[PDB]
PDB file of C-alpha atoms and ligand atoms in Angstrom:
ATOM      1  CA  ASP A   1     146.474 107.403  87.507  1.00  0.00           C
ATOM      2  CA  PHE A   2     142.888 109.016  87.033  1.00  0.00           C
ATOM      3  CA  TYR A   3     140.296 107.500  85.318  1.00  0.00           C
ATOM      4  CA  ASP A   4     136.669 107.968  83.535  1.00  0.00           C
ATOM      5  CA  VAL A   5     134.963 105.171  84.730  1.00  0.00           C
ATOM      6  CA  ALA A   6     135.525 102.143  86.588  1.00  0.00           C
ATOM      7  CA  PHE A   7     134.251  98.489  86.880  1.00  0.00           C
ATOM      8  CA  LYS A   8     134.647  95.335  89.047  1.00  0.00           C
ATOM      9  CA  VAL A   9     136.005  92.390  87.662  1.00  0.00           C
ATOM     10  CA  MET A  10     136.569  88.791  89.006  1.00  0.00           C
ATOM     11  CA  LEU A  11     138.357  86.227  88.384  1.00  0.00           C
ATOM     12  CA  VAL A  12     137.395  82.730  88.912  1.00  0.00           C
ATOM     13  CA  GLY A  13     137.990  79.068  88.055  1.00  0.00           C
ATOM     14  CA  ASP A  14     139.706  75.676  89.693  1.00  0.00           C
ATOM     15  CA  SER A  15     142.656  76.067  91.713  1.00  0.00           C
ATOM     16  CA  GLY A  16     145.981  75.981  90.025  1.00  0.00           C
ATOM     17  CA  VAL A  17     144.614  77.456  86.529  1.00  0.00           C
ATOM     18  CA  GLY A  18     146.639  81.108  86.835  1.00  0.00           C
ATOM     19  CA  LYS A  19     143.953  83.335  88.513  1.00  0.00           C
ATOM     20  CA  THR A  20     146.958  84.934  90.800  1.00  0.00           C
ATOM     21  CA  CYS A  21     149.578  84.538  88.304  1.00  0.00           C
ATOM     22  CA  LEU A  22     147.352  85.730  85.378  1.00  0.00           C
ATOM     23  CA  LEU A  23     146.737  89.099  87.702  1.00  0.00           C
ATOM     24  CA  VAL A  24     150.330  89.605  88.561  1.00  0.00           C
ATOM     25  CA  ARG A  25     151.108  89.537  84.882  1.00  0.00           C
ATOM     26  CA  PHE A  26     149.268  92.251  83.805  1.00  0.00           C
ATOM     27  CA  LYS A  27     149.460  94.480  86.670  1.00  0.00           C
ATOM     28  CA  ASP A  28     153.329  94.001  87.558  1.00  0.00           C
ATOM     29  CA  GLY A  29     154.003  92.997  83.906  1.00  0.00           C
ATOM     30  CA  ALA A  30     155.633  89.884  85.218  1.00  0.00           C
ATOM     31  CA  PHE A  31     156.084  86.058  85.915  1.00  0.00           C
ATOM     32  CA  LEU A  32     157.537  85.089  89.348  1.00  0.00           C
ATOM     33  CA  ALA A  33     157.919  81.303  88.660  1.00  0.00           C
ATOM     34  CA  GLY A  34     157.697  81.409  92.359  1.00  0.00           C
ATOM     35  CA  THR A  35     155.886  79.174  95.309  1.00  0.00           C
ATOM     36  CA  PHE A  36     152.635  78.182  94.374  1.00  0.00           C
ATOM     37  CA  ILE A  37     150.355  80.309  96.899  1.00  0.00           C
ATOM     38  CA  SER A  38     146.927  78.914  97.117  1.00  0.00           C
ATOM     39  CA  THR A  39     144.873  82.307  97.427  1.00  0.00           C
ATOM     40  CA  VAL A  40     142.261  81.559 100.211  1.00  0.00           C
ATOM     41  CA  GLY A  41     140.312  84.578 100.451  1.00  0.00           C
ATOM     42  CA  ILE A  42     139.462  87.316  97.658  1.00  0.00           C
ATOM     43  CA  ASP A  43     141.361  90.605  97.701  1.00  0.00           C
ATOM     44  CA  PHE A  44     141.537  93.196  95.022  1.00  0.00           C
ATOM     45  CA  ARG A  45     143.675  95.358  93.201  1.00  0.00           C
ATOM     46  CA  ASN A  46     143.245  98.411  90.813  1.00  0.00           C
ATOM     47  CA  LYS A  47     144.940  98.626  87.008  1.00  0.00           C
ATOM     48  CA  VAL A  48     143.808 101.782  84.783  1.00  0.00           C
ATOM     49  CA  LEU A  49     143.587 101.250  80.766  1.00  0.00           C
ATOM     50  CA  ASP A  50     143.024 103.241  77.946  1.00  0.00           C
ATOM     51  CA  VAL A  51     140.277 102.117  75.720  1.00  0.00           C
ATOM     52  CA  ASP A  52     139.044 104.355  73.176  1.00  0.00           C
ATOM     53  CA  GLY A  53     140.796 107.637  74.763  1.00  0.00           C
ATOM     54  CA  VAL A  54     138.787 106.876  77.596  1.00  0.00           C
ATOM     55  CA  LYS A  55     140.740 105.682  81.305  1.00  0.00           C
ATOM     56  CA  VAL A  56     138.460 102.455  82.386  1.00  0.00           C
ATOM     57  CA  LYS A  57     139.810 101.394  86.158  1.00  0.00           C
ATOM     58  CA  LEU A  58     139.107  97.806  86.315  1.00  0.00           C
ATOM     59  CA  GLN A  59     139.097  97.195  90.529  1.00  0.00           C
ATOM     60  CA  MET A  60     140.193  93.369  89.958  1.00  0.00           C
ATOM     61  CA  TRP A  61     139.570  91.094  92.589  1.00  0.00           C
ATOM     62  CA  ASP A  62     141.258  87.387  92.468  1.00  0.00           C
ATOM     63  CA  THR A  63     139.207  84.387  94.278  1.00  0.00           C
ATOM     64  CA  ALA A  64     140.150  81.158  95.807  1.00  0.00           C
ATOM     65  CA  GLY A  65     139.431  77.823  93.348  1.00  0.00           C
ATOM     66  CA  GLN A  66     140.000  75.537  96.302  1.00  0.00           C
ATOM     67  CA  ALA A  67     127.505  87.520  97.743  1.00  0.00           C
ATOM     68  CA  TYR A  68     130.622  88.655  95.712  1.00  0.00           C
ATOM     69  CA  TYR A  69     129.360  87.481  92.364  1.00  0.00           C
ATOM     70  CA  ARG A  70     126.164  89.985  92.836  1.00  0.00           C
ATOM     71  CA  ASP A  71     128.567  93.207  92.565  1.00  0.00           C
ATOM     72  CA  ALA A  72     130.727  92.469  89.956  1.00  0.00           C
ATOM     73  CA  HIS A  73     130.350  93.947  86.762  1.00  0.00           C
ATOM     74  CA  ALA A  74     132.208  91.308  84.506  1.00  0.00           C
ATOM     75  CA  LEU A  75     133.874  88.016  85.568  1.00  0.00           C
ATOM     76  CA  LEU A  76     136.793  86.223  83.906  1.00  0.00           C
ATOM     77  CA  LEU A  77     136.585  82.352  83.930  1.00  0.00           C
ATOM     78  CA  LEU A  78     139.983  80.292  83.381  1.00  0.00           C
ATOM     79  CA  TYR A  79     140.881  76.709  82.746  1.00  0.00           C
ATOM     80  CA  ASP A  80     144.276  75.376  82.009  1.00  0.00           C
ATOM     81  CA  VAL A  81     144.812  73.761  78.648  1.00  0.00           C
ATOM     82  CA  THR A  82     147.308  71.158  80.753  1.00  0.00           C
ATOM     83  CA  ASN A  83     144.358  70.345  83.136  1.00  0.00           C
ATOM     84  CA  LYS A  84     141.379  68.283  81.458  1.00  0.00           C
ATOM     85  CA  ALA A  85     139.418  68.480  84.538  1.00  0.00           C
ATOM     86  CA  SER A  86     139.628  72.446  84.916  1.00  0.00           C
ATOM     87  CA  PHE A  87     138.026  72.742  81.305  1.00  0.00           C
ATOM     88  CA  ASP A  88     135.346  70.264  82.397  1.00  0.00           C
ATOM     89  CA  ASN A  89     134.479  72.118  85.000  1.00  0.00           C
ATOM     90  CA  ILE A  90     133.712  75.413  83.260  1.00  0.00           C
ATOM     91  CA  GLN A  91     129.995  74.867  82.878  1.00  0.00           C
ATOM     92  CA  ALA A  92     129.848  74.376  86.605  1.00  0.00           C
ATOM     93  CA  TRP A  93     131.473  77.716  86.828  1.00  0.00           C
ATOM     94  CA  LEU A  94     129.128  78.956  84.468  1.00  0.00           C
ATOM     95  CA  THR A  95     126.205  77.633  86.294  1.00  0.00           C
ATOM     96  CA  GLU A  96     127.093  79.043  89.373  1.00  0.00           C
ATOM     97  CA  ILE A  97     128.085  82.724  87.927  1.00  0.00           C
ATOM     98  CA  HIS A  98     124.579  82.711  85.827  1.00  0.00           C
ATOM     99  CA  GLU A  99     123.227  81.496  89.527  1.00  0.00           C
ATOM    100  CA  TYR A 100     124.428  84.569  91.390  1.00  0.00           C
ATOM    101  CA  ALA A 101     126.083  87.263  89.735  1.00  0.00           C
ATOM    102  CA  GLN A 102     124.250  90.116  88.393  1.00  0.00           C
ATOM    103  CA  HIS A 103     122.272  89.265  85.131  1.00  0.00           C
ATOM    104  CA  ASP A 104     124.131  91.431  83.116  1.00  0.00           C
ATOM    105  CA  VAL A 105     127.893  90.640  83.723  1.00  0.00           C
ATOM    106  CA  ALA A 106     130.058  90.709  81.213  1.00  0.00           C
ATOM    107  CA  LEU A 107     132.231  87.461  80.717  1.00  0.00           C
ATOM    108  CA  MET A 108     135.156  86.024  78.764  1.00  0.00           C
ATOM    109  CA  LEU A 109     136.733  82.138  78.882  1.00  0.00           C
ATOM    110  CA  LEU A 110     140.450  82.512  78.811  1.00  0.00           C
ATOM    111  CA  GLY A 111     142.543  79.118  78.347  1.00  0.00           C
ATOM    112  CA  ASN A 112     145.462  79.879  80.157  1.00  0.00           C
ATOM    113  CA  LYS A 113     148.945  77.879  80.442  1.00  0.00           C
ATOM    114  CA  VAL A 114     149.606  78.071  76.920  1.00  0.00           C
ATOM    115  CA  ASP A 115     153.149  77.923  76.784  1.00  0.00           C
ATOM    116  CA  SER A 116     156.528  75.597  76.652  1.00  0.00           C
ATOM    117  CA  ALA A 117     156.008  74.729  80.309  1.00  0.00           C
ATOM    118  CA  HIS A 118     153.841  71.447  80.244  1.00  0.00           C
ATOM    119  CA  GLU A 119     151.733  70.070  77.545  1.00  0.00           C
ATOM    120  CA  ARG A 120     148.249  71.337  76.259  1.00  0.00           C
ATOM    121  CA  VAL A 121     145.600  68.380  76.691  1.00  0.00           C
ATOM    122  CA  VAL A 122     142.839  70.745  75.886  1.00  0.00           C
ATOM    123  CA  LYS A 123     142.636  72.315  72.017  1.00  0.00           C
ATOM    124  CA  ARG A 124     142.075  75.822  71.468  1.00  0.00           C
ATOM    125  CA  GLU A 125     139.519  74.334  69.083  1.00  0.00           C
ATOM    126  CA  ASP A 126     137.618  72.930  72.007  1.00  0.00           C
ATOM    127  CA  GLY A 127     137.781  76.531  74.106  1.00  0.00           C
ATOM    128  CA  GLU A 128     136.463  78.029  71.194  1.00  0.00           C
ATOM    129  CA  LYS A 129     133.338  75.827  70.762  1.00  0.00           C
ATOM    130  CA  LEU A 130     132.684  75.573  74.869  1.00  0.00           C
ATOM    131  CA  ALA A 131     132.749  79.544  74.405  1.00  0.00           C
ATOM    132  CA  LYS A 132     130.306  79.516  71.019  1.00  0.00           C
ATOM    133  CA  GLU A 133     128.137  77.308  72.596  1.00  0.00           C
ATOM    134  CA  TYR A 134     127.604  79.629  75.626  1.00  0.00           C
ATOM    135  CA  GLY A 135     127.963  82.923  73.673  1.00  0.00           C
ATOM    136  CA  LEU A 136     130.877  83.944  75.515  1.00  0.00           C
ATOM    137  CA  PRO A 137     134.131  85.763  74.024  1.00  0.00           C
ATOM    138  CA  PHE A 138     137.410  83.922  74.271  1.00  0.00           C
ATOM    139  CA  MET A 139     140.979  83.583  74.251  1.00  0.00           C
ATOM    140  CA  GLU A 140     144.027  81.574  75.143  1.00  0.00           C
ATOM    141  CA  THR A 141     146.731  82.862  77.358  1.00  0.00           C
ATOM    142  CA  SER A 142     150.044  82.828  79.260  1.00  0.00           C
ATOM    143  CA  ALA A 143     151.174  84.603  82.878  1.00  0.00           C
ATOM    144  CA  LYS A 144     154.455  83.187  82.044  1.00  0.00           C
ATOM    145  CA  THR A 145     155.138  84.678  78.553  1.00  0.00           C
ATOM    146  CA  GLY A 146     152.535  87.184  78.918  1.00  0.00           C
ATOM    147  CA  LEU A 147     150.501  85.872  75.896  1.00  0.00           C
ATOM    148  CA  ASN A 148     146.898  87.810  75.726  1.00  0.00           C
ATOM    149  CA  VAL A 149     147.114  88.978  78.828  1.00  0.00           C
ATOM    150  CA  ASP A 150     146.398  92.837  78.202  1.00  0.00           C
ATOM    151  CA  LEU A 151     144.450  92.008  75.703  1.00  0.00           C
ATOM    152  CA  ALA A 152     142.180  89.788  77.570  1.00  0.00           C
ATOM    153  CA  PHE A 153     141.669  92.795  80.143  1.00  0.00           C
ATOM    154  CA  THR A 154     141.178  95.486  77.202  1.00  0.00           C
ATOM    155  CA  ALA A 155     138.850  93.234  75.792  1.00  0.00           C
ATOM    156  CA  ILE A 156     136.556  93.130  79.037  1.00  0.00           C
ATOM    157  CA  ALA A 157     136.912  96.784  79.567  1.00  0.00           C
ATOM    158  CA  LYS A 158     135.870  97.976  76.081  1.00  0.00           C
ATOM    159  CA  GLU A 159     132.788  95.330  76.257  1.00  0.00           C
ATOM    160  CA  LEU A 160     132.174  97.416  79.694  1.00  0.00           C
ATOM    161  CA  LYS A 161     132.814 100.578  78.539  1.00  0.00           C
ATOM    162  CA  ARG A 162     130.695  99.859  75.673  1.00  0.00           C
TER     163      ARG A 162
HETATM  164  N1  LIG B   1     153.779  77.777  82.541  1.00  0.00           N
HETATM  165  C1  LIG B   1     152.768  78.434  83.674  1.00  0.00           C
HETATM  166  N2  LIG B   1     152.808  78.344  85.064  1.00  0.00           N
HETATM  167  C2  LIG B   1     151.434  78.843  85.081  1.00  0.00           C
HETATM  168  C3  LIG B   1     150.634  80.025  84.308  1.00  0.00           C
HETATM  169  N3  LIG B   1     149.778  80.618  85.598  1.00  0.00           N
HETATM  170  C4  LIG B   1     150.076  79.785  86.652  1.00  0.00           C
HETATM  171  N4  LIG B   1     150.882  79.559  86.752  1.00  0.00           N
HETATM  172  C5  LIG B   1     151.430  78.182  87.754  1.00  0.00           C
HETATM  173  O1  LIG B   1     150.616  77.899  87.872  1.00  0.00           O
HETATM  174  C6  LIG B   1     150.517  77.546  89.242  1.00  0.00           C
HETATM  175  C7  LIG B   1     149.165  78.025  89.744  1.00  0.00           C
HETATM  176  O2  LIG B   1     148.921  79.378  89.374  1.00  0.00           O
HETATM  177  P1  LIG B   1     148.146  80.322  90.474  1.00  0.00           P
HETATM  178  O3  LIG B   1     148.426  81.510  89.267  1.00  0.00           O
HETATM  179  O4  LIG B   1     148.554  80.198  91.767  1.00  0.00           O
HETATM  180  O5  LIG B   1     146.836  79.630  90.103  1.00  0.00           O
HETATM  181  P2  LIG B   1     145.061  79.581  90.609  1.00  0.00           P
HETATM  182  O6  LIG B   1     144.569  80.047  89.995  1.00  0.00           O
HETATM  183  O7  LIG B   1     145.967  81.517  91.269  1.00  0.00           O
HETATM  184  N5  LIG B   1     145.076  79.106  92.112  1.00  0.00           N
HETATM  185  P3  LIG B   1     144.334  79.271  93.464  1.00  0.00           P
HETATM  186  O8  LIG B   1     142.751  79.193  92.854  1.00  0.00           O
HETATM  187  O9  LIG B   1     144.727  78.132  94.196  1.00  0.00           O
HETATM  188  O10 LIG B   1     144.389  80.701  94.089  1.00  0.00           O
HETATM  189  C8  LIG B   1     151.859  78.045  89.756  1.00  0.00           C
HETATM  190  O11 LIG B   1     152.619  77.274  89.869  1.00  0.00           O
HETATM  191  C9  LIG B   1     152.058  78.848  88.997  1.00  0.00           C
HETATM  192  O12 LIG B   1     153.509  79.651  88.793  1.00  0.00           O
HETATM  193  C10 LIG B   1     150.856  79.953  83.016  1.00  0.00           C
HETATM  194  O13 LIG B   1     150.315  80.770  82.193  1.00  0.00           O
HETATM  195  N6  LIG B   1     152.103  79.067  82.686  1.00  0.00           N
HETATM  196 MG1  LIG B   2     145.738  82.072  93.384  1.00  0.00          MG
END
């Protein structure tokens, strides 16, 4: 698959929030309810998307939640709607990104695991409100059901293209 433009996008957030699964879902269209394998170092995978008749390659970087920043064009920040601590830690992740990433990085906040599996503890409203407070786009997602996964990557690609 060829493309018109390419961007580097990195996923960040607490360990366990769903960074690896979210990427597997977008890239492979599947959710493997497999072994929880905590990511140790960063690694990348490519995917090409159509945006306004333009083909956009995303070079997507997974990262460990338990100098890269300065190279990224965009960062997806995830928390887990069923883990209040992951949401409480979002501002710290934002401070880090603001401190170490290019000043012109695109950002997006994702409240992941919005599905039957576990009980929500963070209301969508509270995530909407945090996003509004820092100017970031926001979406709820699920690697398990596929909720808004394609649409989140499409939106960031769209913002980068424009
Ligand atoms: N129900 C549900 N489980 C999910 C979802 N996303 C991930 N999981 C599960 O939650 C756990 C953590 O997922 P994972 O993708 O490994 O998270 P991570 O953010 O990559 N962790 P780390 O930073 O440690 O590498 C796994 O057991 C995975 O199957 C989701 O949307 N829904
Ligand atoms: Mg991982």
